[PDB]
Amino acid sequence: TVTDIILIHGALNRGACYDAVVPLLEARGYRVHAPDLTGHTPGDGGHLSVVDMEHYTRPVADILARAEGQSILLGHALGGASISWLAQHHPDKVAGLIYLTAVLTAPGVTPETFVLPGEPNRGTPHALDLIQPVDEGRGLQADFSRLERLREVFMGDYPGMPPAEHFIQTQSTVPFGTPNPMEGRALEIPRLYIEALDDVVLPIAVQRQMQKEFPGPVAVVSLPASHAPYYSMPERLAEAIADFADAPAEY
Secondary structure, eight states: OEEEEEEEOOTTBOGGGGTTTHHHHHHTTOEEEOOOOTTOSTTSOOGGGOOSHHHHHHHHHHHHHHOSSEEEEEEEGGGHHHHHHHHHHOTTTEEEEEEESOOOOOTTOOTHHHHSOBTTTBOOHHHHHHEEEEGGGTEEEEOTTOHHHHHHHHSTTSOOOOOGGGBOSEEESHHHHSOOOOOTHHHHSOEEEEEETTOTTTTHHHHHHHHHHSSSOOEEEEEOOOSOHHHHOHHHHHHHHHHHHHOTTTO
């Protein structure tokens, strides 16, 4: 029943960031997607172009529409906020949810609740520190005065640096404010959390707090990884992805 797997980029990234993995999941027989979200394609308008989440996530919904059977939505970092939103609006069309060191918020809880300082086990002080407001506050951009610091925190995973086709310049604050609207059939959908144990953007302590705070069971797999599992262990990540799309409920 599960024909398609859809990989979804986090803040200030692009679908290309997944290139190490797309062939590995194609091998296991799926149709593999790594779209760019609205405002994440150079020359598509940029961060200000994105009205809301329905508009931010439309490129995936388009795919989900064209799927032949079921689909699996993976999200990375802020990408978790998207697959949660889509799950509620296409629960017929998606058969499982992967949150790859991603933001998973209980219904009604926004992603900033965990990005911002809070108790208990909430916030990402490294990420707020290297990501600054721009455009009178309606976009976020990295802090290029500290490039090596940017690499240590976000690109540590890359062997050796990541290519330019992986990132964008400024990110819309739309997914940050919009709460998780999941309900009903949406919550039936199986859930798995791949957590990067060595992530210091989104620290393991915050990763578990979200699983705990989320109503209902979340299956869990654990990668000894930095911020990006895909860069440093595409195989290990690809396997645990394709084992989940083989049988999401049992897994």
